[PDB]
Amino acid sequence: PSRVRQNFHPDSEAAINRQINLELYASYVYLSMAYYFSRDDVALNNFSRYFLHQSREETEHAEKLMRLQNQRGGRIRLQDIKKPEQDDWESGLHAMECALLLEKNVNQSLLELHALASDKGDPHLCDFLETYYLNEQVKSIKELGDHVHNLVKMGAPDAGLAEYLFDTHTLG
Amino acid sequence: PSRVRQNFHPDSEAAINRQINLELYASYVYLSMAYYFSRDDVALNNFSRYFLHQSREETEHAEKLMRLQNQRGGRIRLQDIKKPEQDDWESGLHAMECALLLEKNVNQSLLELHALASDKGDPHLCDFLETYYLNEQVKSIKELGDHVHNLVKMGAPDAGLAEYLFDTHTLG
Amino acid sequence: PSRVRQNFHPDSEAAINRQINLELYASYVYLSMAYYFSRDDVALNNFSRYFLHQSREETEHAEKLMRLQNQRGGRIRLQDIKKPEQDDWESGLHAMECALLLEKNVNQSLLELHALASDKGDPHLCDFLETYYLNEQVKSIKELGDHVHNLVKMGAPDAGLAEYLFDTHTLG
Amino acid sequence: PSRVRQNFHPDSEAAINRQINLELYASYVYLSMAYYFSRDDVALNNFSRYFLHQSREETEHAEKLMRLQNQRGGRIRLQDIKKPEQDDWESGLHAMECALLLEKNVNQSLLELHALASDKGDPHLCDFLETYYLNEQVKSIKELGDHVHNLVKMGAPDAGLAEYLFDTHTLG
Ligand SMILES: [Cl-]
Ligand SMILES: [Cl-]
Ligand SMILES: [Cl-]
Ligand SMILES: [Cl-]
Ligand SMILES: [Cl-]
Ligand SMILES: [Cl-]
Ligand SMILES: [Cl-]
Ligand SMILES: [Cl-]
Ligand SMILES: [Cl-]
Ligand SMILES: [Cl-]
Ligand SMILES: [Cl-]
Ligand SMILES: [Cl-]
Ligand SMILES: [Cl-]
Ligand SMILES: [Cl-]
Ligand SMILES: [Cl-]
Ligand SMILES: [Cl-]
Ligand SMILES: [Cl-]
Ligand SMILES: [Cl-]
Ligand SMILES: [Cl-]
Ligand SMILES: [Cl-]
Ligand SMILES: [Cl-]
Ligand SMILES: [Cl-]
Ligand SMILES: [Cl-]
Ligand SMILES: [Cl-]
Ligand SMILES: [Mg+2]
Ligand SMILES: [Mg+2]
Ligand SMILES: [Mg+2]
Ligand SMILES: [Mg+2]
Ligand SMILES: [Mg+2]
Ligand SMILES: [Mg+2]
Ligand SMILES: [Mg+2]
Ligand SMILES: [Mg+2]
Ligand SMILES: [Mg+2]
Ligand SMILES: [Mg+2]
Ligand SMILES: [Mg+2]
Ligand SMILES: [Mg+2]
Ligand SMILES: [Mg+2]
Ligand SMILES: [Mg+2]
Ligand SMILES: [Mg+2]
Ligand SMILES: [Mg+2]
Ligand SMILES: [Mg+2]
Ligand SMILES: [Mg+2]
Ligand SMILES: [Mg+2]
Ligand SMILES: [Mg+2]
Ligand SMILES: [Mg+2]
Ligand SMILES: [Mg+2]
Ligand SMILES: [Mg+2]
Ligand SMILES: [Mg+2]
Ligand SMILES: [Mg+2]
Ligand SMILES: [Mg+2]
Ligand SMILES: [Mg+2]
Ligand SMILES: [Mg+2]
Ligand SMILES: [Mg+2]
Ligand SMILES: [Mg+2]
Ligand SMILES: [Mg+2]
Ligand SMILES: [Mg+2]
Ligand SMILES: [Mg+2]
Ligand SMILES: [Mg+2]
Ligand SMILES: [Mg+2]
Ligand SMILES: [Mg+2]
Ligand SMILES: [Mg+2]
Ligand SMILES: [Mg+2]
Ligand SMILES: [Mg+2]
Ligand SMILES: [Mg+2]
Ligand SMILES: [Mg+2]
Ligand SMILES: [Mg+2]
Ligand SMILES: [Mg+2]
Ligand SMILES: [Mg+2]
Ligand SMILES: [Mg+2]
Ligand SMILES: [Mg+2]
């Protein structure tokens, strides 16, 4: 093994590689959403900026796991980054609801990773997830829930002023 | 009696202890309201901030009466702080209407305290109430009346944009 | 359930509501102590300031749990805040000893909450307690133990200079 | 009458002249105390400074009443300023206890003046007393009560370190 490797189970190494792919996938989904909102027939520039920011954060989530792999003496194994489920995200509300589902799916993956690290007696990996990932996910899910609630109450997507005003106020 | 006590009737001392409890109760009601508005299914962050500010002001109202008790040589007697009437405050409009009723009830208690201080020939206590409490209550009741009127006219709670826009403009 | 809720057991939600009440109770105990020390027949202004500061910290402990409840999609359920065990706290030493007992009781409640979160496989809640509560309690208990030791050694409460000098030096 | 005089009863004018004399008397008592504490066989320089400050405040209390008399169209009538009851004030504790008795006697005089102004339907004079005198007296009596309590508990006047340490800490 690597002369740095210590208390680092091969199953943990493999699960970190799968999580890297999921974070890169999330970045790509948010990039897709960002450029949907800058279409001439959508033109919600603060929705665009919001999702572009989220995309860049997901790349940093991927990089911190890649750094962890190297720190612990594992070997990064990259896989294809699947295209998102849609190019046409339909509305500001629909994109927010899809983001919320994505963030809960990423959270479930992180909770499974934490359970595996716990089973393998890897407190360093548990602390890493608890310090950089699990509260970030709770905050992200709460923010998206807030946004979905306001957009639904305002009458999105069919009420003509709702997404326009949410874009200016909340995302401005 | 306390070597500081002078012209301070036991009935005034007792009424000050009851007012301390009412101010602490008002703080708790406003704390409850603040955290209702930060629920994921309410998510009106400026309503939240408004009521949190009101909560902290009520604690200062309680503390100034506690200080008065000590200044005059009375003895503070604390009682349970009752839970608010609701955890679910229903809407921005309903919370504002409940706040308005609370502030008029607190005002009536202060007016009764002033009448008692007058009956007991306690001009220091009358001046204390007139300087720190009675105009504060008039201003608070007027502000809440303004807010209720605007929210009703805008169509709250059922008009989808009303509480959202009041939160951004008036409470922003 | 709330569209944000994930891996959040109803027993954890209920235990968080009980902890909120205990933090609000601790705030009230420390408020009582603060205003005992500003009585004309006690007049230890730095003891007063010390306990007032502790009171305000406990309100922030309550608020962070209220925020956690909302973040995780639980529902805050407030209860009466019981009055403290005493209005007359007897001496600087006695108040410090009562504070030490309170902080150990709050610590035991937090340790039980951590054990419950562990049993329910809630690493987010475990990390929250470990990050914001458990070391805060250890530091608070140690500080109060230091203060009790010095006051006992100095001869409090009966040695006429002891609480006066502790107030000026240690709490000044 | 004076072309300014309005709603100003001769009994109020006379009571203001008596209060002017009492404030000038209080200034003289505090001047006496200040210079007792700078004797070579007393030499408590912060007790001296404390009472000198109180003396100068009493002169300002006298001047504000003299200004009120002129503002309302009354005529100032000065009388002898009686010497204080003692040149030898015995101890720091005894001077503080005598100051406390003086301030309660001045407070009783002000409360009688307020009752007279009330009987004569003079709200300007009532407000003047409530704004500049009655809370000043409550604060002064409370401070002196605090000081007396600490000096008694510390063992003054017989405990050799008590007045020395109170002078350095509390009055420093
Ligand atoms: Cl290994
Ligand atoms: Cl592949
Ligand atoms: Cl693949
Ligand atoms: Cl472990
Ligand atoms: Cl909703
Ligand atoms: Cl607008
Ligand atoms: Cl009395
Ligand atoms: Cl009770
Ligand atoms: Cl009760
Ligand atoms: Cl009166
Ligand atoms: Cl209306
Ligand atoms: Cl605007
Ligand atoms: Cl759940
Ligand atoms: Cl209850
Ligand atoms: Cl209860
Ligand atoms: Cl766990
Ligand atoms: Cl000890
Ligand atoms: Cl010292
Ligand atoms: Cl006249
Ligand atoms: Cl004369
Ligand atoms: Cl004379
Ligand atoms: Cl009048
Ligand atoms: Cl005493
Ligand atoms: Cl020192
Ligand atoms: Mg080697
Ligand atoms: Mg391998
Ligand atoms: Mg995958
Ligand atoms: Mg753009
Ligand atoms: Mg991520
Ligand atoms: Mg494919
Ligand atoms: Mg384990
Ligand atoms: Mg950790
Ligand atoms: Mg953290
Ligand atoms: Mg995020
Ligand atoms: Mg906003
Ligand atoms: Mg006495
Ligand atoms: Mg009594
Ligand atoms: Mg009541
Ligand atoms: Mg907020
Ligand atoms: Mg109030
Ligand atoms: Mg009940
Ligand atoms: Mg009257
Ligand atoms: Mg009046
Ligand atoms: Mg007044
Ligand atoms: Mg005013
Ligand atoms: Mg107010
Ligand atoms: Mg406006
Ligand atoms: Mg849904
Ligand atoms: Mg339930
Ligand atoms: Mg409890
Ligand atoms: Mg103080
Ligand atoms: Mg606490
Ligand atoms: Mg009870
Ligand atoms: Mg476990
Ligand atoms: Mg752990
Ligand atoms: Mg942790
Ligand atoms: Mg820490
Ligand atoms: Mg602490
Ligand atoms: Mg020290
Ligand atoms: Mg003329
Ligand atoms: Mg005349
Ligand atoms: Mg006289
Ligand atoms: Mg000097
Ligand atoms: Mg005076
Ligand atoms: Mg004579
Ligand atoms: Mg009248
Ligand atoms: Mg007035
Ligand atoms: Mg005033
Ligand atoms: Mg004074
Ligand atoms: Mg001091």
Judge residue C111's burial from the number of C-beta atoms within 10 Å of its C-beta, 0-12 exposed, 13-18 middle, 19 or more buried. middle
Q: Is A121 exposed, middle or buried (0-12, 13-18, 19+ CB in 10 A)?
A: exposed
The neighbour count for residue B101, using CB atoms within 10 Å, is: 11
C164 touches chain D (CB under 8 A): yes
User: Rounded to whole angstroms, how far apart are CA atoms B91 and B102?
Assistant: 16
Q: Which residues of D touch B71 (CB under 8 A)?
A: 138-139, 142
Tokens of D32: 């006496």
- The sign of the dihedral angle between the CA atoms of D85, D90, D95, D101 is negative
Q: In whole angstroms, what is the distance from residue B79 CA to residue C145 CA?
A: 29
How far apart CA A164 and CA A142 sit, in angstroms, is 22
Which resolution, in Å, applies to this structure? 1.2
Task: Give the three-state DSSP class for B81.
Answer: strand
Q: Please count the helices (runs of H) and the strands (runs of E) in chain B.
A: 6, 0
User: With an 8 Å Cβ cutoff, is B159 touching chain A?
Assistant: no
Chains B and C touch (3+ CB pairs under 8 A): yes
Q: Name which of C3, C123, C128 is nearest A145 (Cβ-Cβ).
A: C3
Put simply, whether A168 touches B (Cβ < 8 Å) is no
Distance CA B23, CA B29 (A): 10
Q: Say if the Cβ atoms of B80 and C79 lie within 8 Å.
A: no
Q: How far apart are CA A157 and CA B141, in angstroms?
A: 38
Count of CB atoms within 10 A of residue A67's CB? Answer: 11
Chain C CB contacts of B28 below 8 Å: 24, 78, 81
Provide, as residue numbers in chain D, all residues whose Cβ is less than 8 Å from the Cβ of C40. 142, 145-146, 149
Q: How determined?
A: X-ray
Q: Which of C4, C75, C80 sits opposite B82 (nearest CB)?
A: C80
- Walk me through the domains of chain C, giving residue ranges and CATH numbers: 10-167 (1.20.1260.10)
B164 CB near a chain A CB, below 8 Å? yes
Task: Count CB neighbours of A46 within 10 A.
Answer: 16
- Nearest-ligand number for the alpha carbon of A84: 30
**CA–CA gap between residue D69 and residue D77 (Å, rounded):** 10
Q: Give the DSSP letter of residue C81.
A: B
Q: How far apart are CA A154 and CA B163, in angstroms?
A: 9
Alpha-carbon distance A152 to B139, whole Å?
35
Chains B and A touch (3+ CB pairs under 8 A): yes
Cα separation, C151 vs C149, whole angstroms = 6
Q: Touching check for D108 and chain B: CB below 8 Å?
A: yes
Give the helix, strand, coil percentages of chain C, each rounded to 5: 70, 0, 30
The candidate with the shortest Cα–Cα distance to A89, out of A47, A143, A141, is A47
Is the Cβ pair C160, D154 closer than 8 Å?
yes
Q: What is the rounded CA–CA span in Å between residue C155 and residue C164? A: 11
Among chain C residues, the shortest Cα distance to A112 is held by C121
Distance CA B126, CA B115 (A): 8
Rg (CA), chain C: 18
Spatial contact of D48 and D95, defined as CB atoms under 8 Å apart: no
